[PDB]
């Protein structure tokens, strides 16, 4: 006997679900991209990297009120010196990979 044509119901239900989903993500990476474009704008202070630093979370990290920045980033953190002679700590670096920054 020839049996279990269920594959076709498997098949097409996949085909549509994938095809639309991909397209939707294509849109959002488009949209979010222009969002980034508007943060850059133009005037930028210039400054020097003083440091490159590596810190780890607290022993307990509840949800509730908790800050998703001062802890729970696995990468480096930095310290910078502005031209106006201020020093700032940066718990996250931004649009640049730390692997290519040096004091």
């Amino acid at each position: 006997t020839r049996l279990l044509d269920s594959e076709i119901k498997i098949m097409k239900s996949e085909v549509l679900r994938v095809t639309h989903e991909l397209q939707a993500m294509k849109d959002k990476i488009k949209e979010n991209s222009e969002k980034i474009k508007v943060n850059k704008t133009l005037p930028y202070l210039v400054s020097n990297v003083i440091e490159l630093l590596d810190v780890d979370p607290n022993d307990q990290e509840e949800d509730g009120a908790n800050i998703d920045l001062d802890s729970q980033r696995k990468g480096k953190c930095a310290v910078i010196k502005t031209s106006t002679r201020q020093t700032y700590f940066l718990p996250v670096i931004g649009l640049v990979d730390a692997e290519k920054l040096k004091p």
Partner: protein, 35 residues
């Protein structure tokens, strides 16, 4: 006789190839925007 799936599977495979790599493009972009 029934062999229906094969060709469409290949189509789905190309879609898989797209979709998986597209998720990479998504994740990194969001990792920028959230910052």
């Amino acid at each position: 006789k029934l062999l229906e799936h094969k060709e469409i599977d290949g189509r789905l495979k190309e879609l898989r190839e797209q979709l998986k790599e597209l998720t990479k493009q998504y994740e990194k972009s969001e990792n920028d925007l959230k910052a």
